[PDB]
């Protein structure tokens, strides 16, 4: 599986059946319809903890993973129940600034997404957390271009040393929270992964503000290779996926 022409979004089915289940991810998000829900919680993100480790090419896109082994990045309030712990965080980005989200606002399209991925400590690992409806929360976030994110930096520079498939790099000491929008108001609604397994055991959590990056910082994310090392050279841009049908889900807004 792939973003080809040969193995796209459009040909996960054949091996992903669920790939056209009733709730899958991404989607669209009707500003109109979404239903304002008083009884939503302010979202409780705690990571001054977080620990990093590394930095890794894994053929699709790039993560930065986390030690997980106890309680020190994590995520609670909203809608969730019980904490969620940072596994890892990655990013979807296209070929030109038009495109590369995988949530859409009202159709819109940003330039780029940013998931943070949680499991429910209730489960013990994140191995079993996949195998159930509550199992994870991945806290979206839209970037657009503008000014440069200081606290995205660090990433740019290190995305040299691992421009190939299976490339990894130790990723220690890094801040999360400078990734972070002012506002934490969301939509939540309950979904999928985007990528092969597609399991249907995320709550998602899209944020409604926006980061800015620089043209050259997201200029650098797209110089990434799909390709292993000593392979024909093929540009990891446009690894996201396009937007599912509702199918009678409601999204909420906590404003």
């Given at each position: 599986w792939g973003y080809g022409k040969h193995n796209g979004p459009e040909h996960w089915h054949k091996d992903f059946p669920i790939a056209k289940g009733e709730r899958q991810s991404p989607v669209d998000i009707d500003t109109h319809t979404a239903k304002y829900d008083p009884s939503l919680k302010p979202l409780s993100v705690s990571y001054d903890q977080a620990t990093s480790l590394r930095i890794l090419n894994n053929g699709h896109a790039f993560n930065v993973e986390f030690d997980?082994?106890?309680?020190?990045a994590v995520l609670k309030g909203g809608p969730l129940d019980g904490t969620y712990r940072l596994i890892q965080f990655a990013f979807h980005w296209g070929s030109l600034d038009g495109q590369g989200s995988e949530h859409t606002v009202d159709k819109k399209k940003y330039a780029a997404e940013l998931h943070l991925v949680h499991w429910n400590?209730?489960?013990?690992?994140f191995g079993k957390a996949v195998?159930?409806?509550?199992?994870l929360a991945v806290l979206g976030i839209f970037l657009k271009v503008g000014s440069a994110k200081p606290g995205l930096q660090k990433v740019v520079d290190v995305l040299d040393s691992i421009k190939t498939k299976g490339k990894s790099a130790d990723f220690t000491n890094f801040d999360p929270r400078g990734l972070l929008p002012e506002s934490l108001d969301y939509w939540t609604y309950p979904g999928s992964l985007?990528?092969?397994?597609?399991?249907?055991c995320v709550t998602w959590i899209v944020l409604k503000e926006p980061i800015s990056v620089s043209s050259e910082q997201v200029l650098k994310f797209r110089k990434l290779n799909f390709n292993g090392e000593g392979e024909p050279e093929e540009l990891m841009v446009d690894n996201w996926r396009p937007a599912q049908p509702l199918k009678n889900r409601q999204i909420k807004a906590s404003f």
């Open positions: 997980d082994s106890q309680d020190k400590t209730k489960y013990g690992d195998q159930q409806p509550d199992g985007t990528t092969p397994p597609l399991l249907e």
